[PDB]
Structure formats: structure tokens, C-alpha cells
Design a protein around this nucleic acid. Structure first.
Lengths: 45, 978
RNA sequence: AAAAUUUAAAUUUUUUUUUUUUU
């Protein structure tokens, strides 16, 4: 069904738009494990 | 709230062996030519020695059992020969006799013929069949009647005429093999030897696809012969072949000269006649420079002199057909046959006209040319009739016609030798430019003069009309063998039948296409470099500590966080209202050339008066000038322009031990590294030779005042910049302020040096894969992107499934090669010929069978033009999707690929018009008409195929109805050699 | 401005008599 699952895509589209909006490199400095979790969340991707 | 606007919002933001060259040298009878001195140094016999080269090498499969062919004692002359054969020919026939394929690449006069003569009988005595190749019918017509006289039992295969289909020996043109390699002639199944002549036409950007692919389509059992003009890069071919059919292949190079050549320069209306290249192939500078001196119609002096010199025959070369006809008239007051010979001319000539109808025995163009032909004079170009084309060359070969006015066919048209070659136009049009002719062009355009057993020498005479550059006349005449590389492209009928034949693929063609041999050769060298780089990397690869990587990972976080701040330090609507003279400032232009600490001369803005609409940065329209004492002594102080930051080179700081001076540079806000908080005496005296040098010593006195460091204008405390954007930005460094100092061995255990220990590993970490990306980028078939677009096309056309299974639509043009197969399916699938008559649709078939543009035809009778308007409507939508295919084809230019002008003449030959009458309706020469007429039969016959495959019974009634109405009187032309 | 480019359709002999279907 289009209107359901794409609304869930739009939900994650905005969340994807919500992702690299913050400065992300600063805790990649403060640990690898931030970056590695960001790597692990990219492993979902 | 369109559903792509969520993309738009801003978020919520906080092999080589048997390699030898051999030498061969003989003596030649003396000759002076038309220079009155001898051409070379004489020997004691009155002879003149020449010498030439015999290279041999062979390409190797891996692990192959090799014995040297120089040792190969040939047990039997499978063809014996009357005279002494040559050493490379001796080297040649052993390769045939021992049974491996071989390229020999020589000139046509050398005797490459003789090697082809041998393998026939070795095929014949083993009852094998053999293919002799040619690009031209008349090349075969030479070789056929020759071999027909020689061995007799030889099959000829031509689009014009087949003779004796089940003979033992076969002579045929290139595409017929390709055609009978697609549908698998069993004719092939008794063939073990192939004679490829004219191999270098693989670099034909027009047709060279055929020679390349057909060799790829060979079974690997077969032995092969390869004959072509001398190329320097012959081995590449053998290096290509020996893998892809997996058997050895020899090479033989020579540069041999059969009859000896003498190059002369005639300035048009100049009177110097200068041997500038001897038979020993030496550039005479001085004769050329005398020819440079002797440069201050003209032919008519030259020829009777040559006729006084008795250097008949003589061949004139234009760069266009019409020029010869002019040059025919510029010479025609002479005569060079006896009336016995002119009776011998005319009587035999009428036998040439005997094979025409008596109505055709009075055709106008032949009436005109015949008195020139009576005058011992001939012209060569395509535009004549083929019956005209053959009779001349005969009489040329039988020497009645001392003169030939020729173009580039007769350059390729061999077995018709000359004594004297005339270069009337030095340059020549190459499709793009009337260019200075390149080397192997001229070398191919050289050797045609000089009969082997008869002519003493070769006479080379070039008329020039420019004082040419010296290396160009070298690069033309002291020439180079031109490089032979694949002109492989794609074509859709090929794309058809490789799906239609099951066993192989079009991709498979690309795996063995020579067009990527560029992508073959240099890469193992770079692999060797990679095999080097994968080793040198392994030396520094492990340091003492892992944390130095993490320190570099800290340093990676260090290096970027300083990077982002300086572009915010260099703020465009800042470093402003603080730029006053004497304010002590740190100077580092653009992040490229750091100039220490200086004092502001002034601040200004660059005004662009010459270009109103250009862009400077809001940094860079602002011009600051600053005295530094960090200027190098030998910088071009006089060459930098005031208030322009365009600094030339040599302007730099004083390097290690170099003398520092003071100078003033125009700088912008990008040059500002930082700005301090002190103001010394900045002189209102601008430039009086020692106020900028008092700045720098005062800078040195300020370098006495703060030798440690100037308190910089803090954006917090001094410039009072208070932005939550700006202040939170520094926090990235405010970890590095902490954490770098916090880390164990920040610089203990020589970690600074151990950084470079890591870094020299880390650079090797970078640059191999950087190279290895390039090599992995240097892998694949680059043509797939073309092909993958063409895979779209037929699916868009419905010629096959997306599972690539060919439809009946695509099954149509399987017997179509002779035209646009992409269009011709759709026209018949648009069925517009149901109400076309045989006179009507034939004019539409004139829209295919001919390419070269000419004068405008009128807008014809619209029952032609409206179908012509109809087919034009079809191909656009086709080319539309081709434009949609990312296939870079101009749809407009794709239409004028179709030429629509002879349709009237086509419409009237359908109505039984006279050949005489229709000659009036064009400038296009009469054979060229027949060259599309006999093309048009090949079309209509392949059109007869289609309704058989569809069942359009009306069409089949209509198809041969056309074929009746074209195939007739003058279209029935046959040749004389056959 | 020249230059030239394509095909191929199949031949000569072994068999057994007829009636007979419901006013």
C-alpha cells in the first residue's frame, strides 16, 4: 500500500534529514564508539 | 505539499622469442634520373649497393614447445619457384611449412604475393580449402584471373559474381567470411589456411570493424596468413592474436625497396628540380634549401620533358575528381600513341563497347573522354562507369595510356605499375582538413612507380606551392609508417545475430576486441609497480604502537578543526574597522604562503572598472597592504603591482638562510592569518625608500618586544565577537586543547618522529590503493556503457524481451545489413507501402541507398514527398528514445542522415526512363548512380526476405514488381577480367 | 573533398475378384 508505507518512508526521510543536521564529527573525536555506533547505525543502512 | 518538498526543507539544526633482425644487401644498376649527376655513390662495377632489413620474431603461447624456424629445413617445395627467393620469403614459407600462422608486413612491390602463392598448394596437396581475402572486388579480379591462370581450380565469391562454388581454393571479400561465419557455412569445415591481405584496414574508422570481428570469430584450429603495409607496431597484432586463438604467430618485418625511388621537388612556376631524398633515403637539406631557394598548367612543361626523359608511364594525383578533368584539358594538345596503336586502341575499345546495348553504345560521357583516351591519356577516379574503370587500367597496364589522372583508389589499386608519380596537391582533405598528408599515407602513396624487372628506378616528383617547414617535408616524404590501432565501434545487426546465434555472446566479442589493448598493455607494468608498492608498504606497515594511528586519528581530528576555524577567522563581514595602519597583523596569504607578522599599510577596496559584472570575494575585493620584513631579498619587488594581489612567482618569503627584506604586498581578508593588538609608528610617508624598512626593523623591535608571541585580537576579548555560532564552534578545538595534551605520549617516546614513522607507513597506506583504484579502474570493457545503452534500444523497440529473447520484430532485419536496420523494420511495421506503388516506394528506398550530399533537388511530386514526410515522422520518435537512451545523437542531424534527392530520378527509371535522359538530372556521376543502383538491388532482394518471414502476400507481389522494374539494361553490367 | 563495402537455396517405383442389411 502506497499511502501507508511511504508515509512511514517520509517519517524516516525526515529522520534521515534529521541525521547529519547536527555536527557529527565532534563525538567522533570524543570517541570512536560514537562513530562506531554511527558506523553500526550505518550497518543498518 | 508535493511529496518531493521534504528533500528541500532545511532540517532542525542545533611472448618474445626468436627475435632477430637480419641484413640483406644487393647492388643496383646506376641511374642519374633527371639530375645530371648520379643519384648515389657508384661502385666499381658501375653498380650501386643498397641494403635493407629482415626482422623476425614470433609470439608465444605459454609453455609451448618451440624449435627455431630459422633451423626449419623445408623438406619439399610445396610450390617450387623459378628464381631465387628472398631470405624473409625463405623465412616466410617455413612458417607455413612448419604449420604456424604468421604476419609478414611489407610493401606491395616486395613480393608478399609470393608467400600467398605457396600456401595454396600446401592446402591443395592436403586437399584443404583456403581463403584468400580482399577489400575490393577489383583486388580480387586482379588476383582471381591471375590464380585462375595459375591453378585454375579456384572458387571466386563476390557480391557481384560467384564462380565455381565447390572448388578447392577460395577467393572472397572480407564480409562474406563474416556472413558465412554467422550462419556457419560448412564451406568453412575444410579450411585450415586463411590468407588475410590488406590487414591494416582494421584502422578504417568506416569498415575496420569487419576485419577485427571476423578474426575473433575464427575457430582456433585454423592457420592464418597476414599481409599488409609496413606498420611499426606489428608485434602488438601478434601479441593480440596469439592469446585469443591460442597458437603461435610469427612476425616478419622488412623495409625493402624493390625498385629504387628518387624524390624530386618542383616548385610550381619555380625551376629547381631537386633530388632531396636519394635511393639511400637521405634528406638532402641543401637541395631542399635550394628548393627553398627555388620557390619564387606548369605540368605541360614537365611532361614533355618527362617525355623527353622517356619516363612513361606517368601518373597525376589530384585530391579531387574534378581537378583531373581540368588537368586533362590543361595537357591535351599532345598525343602519345601511333595510329597503328590508335587502331589497336580503338578496335579493342569497341570490343569493350561491344558488351553494351547499341542504345548504350552512344552514351555521352564516354563520347567525350574517348579522344583523350585516344591521345594516350587516361583519367582515374570512381565517378566513371565500372566498364570504363576496367578498360583504362588495362590500357594503362598495356601502356597505351602514358598519362593517368588519378585519385586514391589507384593508390590502393595495385597490379598496374607505374614509372612516374606526380603529386599535384601536396595537402589533401581528410574529412576534416585539407591537411599536410601524413607519412605512411605518402609511403603507401609512394611505391606505385617502378616496374620490377623493367624500370631502372622509381621517379618521385612532387609539385609544391609553399616553402614548407623542413621537418614536415621530412614527416611527409622521409616518412613514418603509420600506427595501426582498432577502430572498433558497435552496430545493431551485429547486436542482432549474436543473440540469434546461441553459442556466444556480444560481451564475448568485447573480451577479445583489440580496441581494449590500450587497456591491456601498460597495466602489468603498473602491477609491477604495485607489486613494488605492495612490498615497500609492508616495511613501514607496523610501527611500535597502535596509538600513533589513533594519534594520527587525533591528528586527523586536529588538522581539520584548525582548518574550519581559519575560514571563520577570515570572516568577510569582519576583519573590518580594525584594519588601521600600524595594527600589527599576521600575514598568511590564502593558506599557501605564511609571511610572519606585519604592520598594516592601509586598507582599501579593489574597484573593477574594466569588467563591471565580475566577482571578487567579500574577502578579495578588499585590498589591504601590509609591510612585512619577511620578504625574500631577490623577490621581484618591481614586478608586483600595487593594490593587486596577483603575485607573480619568485615573490616568496626568505627561505632557509635567504635574506629577509621589507616590501609591501596587496593583500585581502583571505591573507589574514590573525591580527594582534599593538600599533607602532606606521609612516604616513607612503614610499620614500626606507619607511617600509623602518617598519620591519620596528617589527624586529616588536620581535624584540614580544619575541614569544603577540596577543592576537581575541574575538571574545578584543573584537568582541559574541556569537553562539562562533563560540560553540571553537569547542571542537577545545577538546584538542585538552585531549591532545591529555593523551599518553603526546610527544614522549619521540612520538612526533614516530608520527612520521606512522605517516611514512600511512602515505604508503594511501598511495598504493590510490594507484590500485586506477588499475581496478583500468580493468573493464569500457564499451559496455555504449552497449548497455543499446540493450535499452531494442527493448524500447520491442525487438527483444527484457530477458533479451529476440522478437519477430528483431527477427526481421536479420537479413538486413544494407541499410538502417533500426528504421527499416519500423517502416514495414508502419505498413505504409500498402498504398505505395513500385514506382512510389522505390524513391523511398532511394532515401537509404546513398549517403553523400549534393545539390538540392526540388520539392518533388508529393506522393513521394508525403511518404517521405511519413518516414521522417517515424525515425524521430525512434531517435527521440535514442536521445532518451543517453545516446548522444542529434535528432536533427539524425534526420539529415537520410538523403532524399535522387527520388525523382528513381521515380523515372521506374517509369522506363533512358539512361541518357536521367544523366541530365544530376551532377552525380554515372557509376555512382549505378553504385547505388546495384546497391538498391541488394536492398530490394533483402526486402523480398521480409514478407516471407511475415506473410504479407501483397508485399511479395509488390516486392518483385519493383525488382522487375529496376533490374534491366544498364543495370546488367559485368566486368572484363572475369 | 576523396575512397570504397556485402549471398549461399533440395532429382530417377513393394502386393490379395465383385453379396448381403426390416411394405
Amino acid at each position: 500500500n502506497p499511502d501507508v508505507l511511504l508515509s512511514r518512508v517520509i517519517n524516516v526521510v525526515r529522520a534521515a534529514s534529521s541525521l547529519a543536521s547536527q555536527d557529527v564529527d565532534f563525538y567522533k573525536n570524543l570517541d570512536r564508539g560514537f562513530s562506531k555506533d554511527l558506523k553500526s547505525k550505518a550497518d543498518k543502512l | 505539499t508535493d511529496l518531493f518538498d521534504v528533500f528541500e526543507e532545511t532540517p532542525v539544526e542545533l611472448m618474445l622469442a626468436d627475435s632477430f633482425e637480419q641484413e640483406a644487401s644487393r647492388e643496383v644498376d646506376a641511374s642519374k634520373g633527371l639530375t645530371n649527376s648520379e643519384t648515389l655513390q657508384v661502385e666499381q662495377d658501375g653498380k650501386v649497393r643498397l641494403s635493407h632489413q629482415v626482422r623476425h620474431q614470433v609470439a608465444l603461447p605459454p609453455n609451448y614447445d618451440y624449435t627455431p624456424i630459422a633451423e626449419h629445413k623445408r623438406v619439399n617445395e610445396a610450390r617450387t619457384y623459378p628464381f631465387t627467393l628472398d631470405p624473409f620469403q625463405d623465412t616466410a614459407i617455413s612458417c607455413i611449412d612448419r604449420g604456424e600462422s604468421v604476419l609478414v608486413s611489407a610493401h606491395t612491390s616486395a613480393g608478399k604475393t609470393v608467400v600467398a602463392e605457396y600456401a595454396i598448394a600446401q592446402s591443395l596437396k592436403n586437399k584443404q580449402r583456403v581463403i584468400y581475402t580482399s577489400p575490393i572486388k577489383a583486388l580480387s579480379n586482379q588476383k582471381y584471373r591471375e590464380l585462375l591462370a595459375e591453378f585454375g581450380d579456384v572458387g571466386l565469391m563476390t557480391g557481384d559474381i560467384t564462380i565455381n562454388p565447390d572448388a578447392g581454393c577460395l577467393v572472397m571479400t572480407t564480409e562474406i567470411l563474416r556472413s558465412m561465419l554467422y550462419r556457419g557455412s560448412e564451406v568453412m569445415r575444410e579450411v585450415a589456411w586463411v590468407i588475410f591481405d590488406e590487414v591494416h584496414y582494421m584502422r578504417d574508422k568506416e569498415r575496420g570493424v569487419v576485419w577485427e570481428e571476423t578474426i575473433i570469430l575464427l575457430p582456433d584450429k585454423v592457420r592464418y596468413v597476414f599481409l599488409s603495409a609496413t606498420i611499426p607496431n606489428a608485434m602488438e597484432f601478434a601479441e593480440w592474436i596469439c592469446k585469443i586463438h591460442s597458437q603461435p604467430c610469427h612476425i616478419v618485418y622488412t623495409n625493402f625497396r624493390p625498385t629504387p625511388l628518387q624524390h624530386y621537388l618542383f616548385p610550381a612556376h619555380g625551376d629547381g628540380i631537386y633530388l632531396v631524398v636519394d635511393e639511400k633515403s637521405t634528406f638532402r637539406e641543401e637541395n631542399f634549401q635550394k628548393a627553398m631557394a627555388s620557390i619564387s598548367g606548369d605540368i605541360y612543361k614537365i611532361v614533355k620533358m618527362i617525355w623527353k626523359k622517356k619516363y612513361n608511364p606517368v601518373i597525376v594525383f589530384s585530391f579531387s575528381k574534378r581537378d583531373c578533368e581540368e588537368l586533362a584539358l590543361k595537357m591535351s594538345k599532345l598525343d602519345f600513341n601511333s595510329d597503328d596503336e590508335k587502331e589497336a586502341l580503338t578496335k579493342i575499345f569497341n570490343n569493350a563497347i561491344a558488351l553494351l546495348p547499341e542504345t548504350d553504345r552512344e552514351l555521352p560521357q564516354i563520347k567525350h573522354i574517348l579522344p583523350l583516351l585516344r591521345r594516350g591519356i587516361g583519367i582515374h577516379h570512381s565517378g566513371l562507369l565500372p566498364i570504363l574503370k576496367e578498360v583504362i587500367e588495362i590500357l594503362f597496364q598495356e601502356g597505351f595510356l602514358k598519362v593517368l589522372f588519378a585519385t586514391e583508389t589507384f593508390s590502393i589499386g595495385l597490379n598496374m605499375p607505374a614509372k612516374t608519380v606526380v603529386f599535384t596537391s601536396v595537402r589533401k582533405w581528410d574529412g576534416q582538413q585539407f591537411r599536410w598528408v601524413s607519412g605512411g599515407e605518402y609511403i603507401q602513396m609512394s611505391g606505385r612507380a617502378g616496374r620490377r624487372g623493367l624500370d631502372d628506378r622509381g621517379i618521385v616528383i612532387m609539385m609544391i606551392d609553399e616553402k614548407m617547414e623542413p621537418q614536415v617535408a621530412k614527416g611527409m616524404v622521409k616518412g613514418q609508417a603509420d600506427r595501426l590501432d582498432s577502430a572498433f565501434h558497435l552496430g545493431y545487426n551485429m547486436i542482432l545475430n549474436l543473440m540469434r546465434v546461441e553459442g556466444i555472446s556480444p560481451e564475448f566479442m568485447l573480451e577479445h576486441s583489440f580496441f581494449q589493448f590500450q587497456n591491456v598493455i601498460s597495466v602489468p607494468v603498473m602491477e609491477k609497480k604495485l607489486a613494488e608498492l605492495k612490498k615497500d608498504f609492508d616495511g613501514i606497515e607496523v610501527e611500535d604502537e597502535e596509538n600513533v594511528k589513533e594519534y594520527h586519528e587525533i591528528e586527523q581530528a586536529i588538522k581539520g578543526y584548525r582548518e574550519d576555524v581559519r575560514q571563520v577567522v577570515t570572516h568577510p563581514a569582519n576583519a573590518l574597522s580594525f584594519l588601521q595602519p600600524g595594527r600589527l597583523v599576521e600575514i598568511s596569504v590564502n593558506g599557501k604562503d605564511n609571511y610572519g607578522w606585519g604592520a598594516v599599510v592601509d586598507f582599501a577596496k579593489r574597484i573593477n572598472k574594466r569588467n563591471p559584472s565580475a566577482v571578487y570575494t567579500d574577502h578579495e575585493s578588499y585590498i589591504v597592504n601590509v609591510v612585512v620584513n619577511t620578504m625574500y631579498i631577490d623577490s621581484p619587488v618591481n614586478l608586483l603591482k600595487p593594490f593587486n594581489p596577483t603575485l607573480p612567482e619568485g615573490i616568496r618569503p626568505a627561505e632557509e638562510g635567504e635574506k629577509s627584506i621589507c616590501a609591501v604586498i596587496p593583500i585581502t581578508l583571505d591573507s589574514i592569518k590573525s591580527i594582534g593588538n599593538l600599533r607602532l609608528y606606521m609612516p604616513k610617508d607612503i614610499r620614500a625608500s626606507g619607511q617600509k624598512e623602518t617598519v620591519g626593523k620596528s617589527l624586529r623591535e616588536v620581535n624584540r618586544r614580544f619575541p614569544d608571541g603577540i596577543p592576537v585580537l581575541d574575538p571574545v576579548k578584543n573584537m568582541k565577537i559574541e556569537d553562539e555560532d562562533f563560540l560553540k564552534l571553537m569547542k571542537k578545538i577545545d577538546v584538542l586543547n585538552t585531549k591532545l595534551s591529555s593523551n599518553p605520549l603526546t610527544n614522549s617516546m619521540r612520538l612526533e618522529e614516530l608520527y612520521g614513522k606512522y605517516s611514512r607507513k600511512h602515505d604508503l597506506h594511501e598511495d598504493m590503493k590510490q594507484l590500485k583504484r586506477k588499475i581496478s579502474e583500468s580493468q573493464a570493457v569500457i564499451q559496455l556503457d555504449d552497449l548497455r545503452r543499446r540493450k535499452r534500444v531494442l527493448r524500447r523497440l520491442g525487438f527483444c524481451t527484457p530477458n533479451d529473447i529476440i522478437e519477430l520484430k528483431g527477427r526481421v532485419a536479420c537479413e538486413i545489413s544494407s541499410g538502417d536496420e533500426l528504421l527499416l523494420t519500423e517502416l514495414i511495421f508502419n505498413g505504409n507501402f500498402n498504398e505505395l506503388k513500385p514506382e512510389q516506394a522505390a524513391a523511398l528506398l532511394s532515401c537509404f541507398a546513398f549517403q553523400e550530399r549534393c545539390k538540392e533537388a526540388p520539392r518533388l511530386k508529393p506522393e513521394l514527398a508525403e511518404p517521405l514526410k511519413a518516414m521522417r515522422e517515424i525515425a524521430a520518435k525512434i531517435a527521440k528514445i535514442m536521445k532518451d537512451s543517453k545516446i548522444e545523437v542529434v535528432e536533427k542531424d539524425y534526420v539529415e542522415s537520410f538523403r532524399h534527392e535522387l527520388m525523382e530520378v528513381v521515380y523515372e527509371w521506374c517509369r522506363g526512363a533512358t539512361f541518357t535522359q536521367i544523366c541530365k538530372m544530376t551532377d552525380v556521376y554515372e557509376g555512382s548512380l549505378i553504385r547505388m543502383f546495384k546497391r538498391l538491388e541488394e536492398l530490394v532482394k533483402e526486402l523480398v526476405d521480409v514478407a516471407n518471414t511475415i506473410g504479407n502476400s501483397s508485399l511479395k507481389e509488390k516486392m518483385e514488381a519493383v525488382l522487375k522494374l529496376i533490374h534491366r539494361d544498364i543495370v546488367s553490367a559485368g566486368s572484363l577480367y572475369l
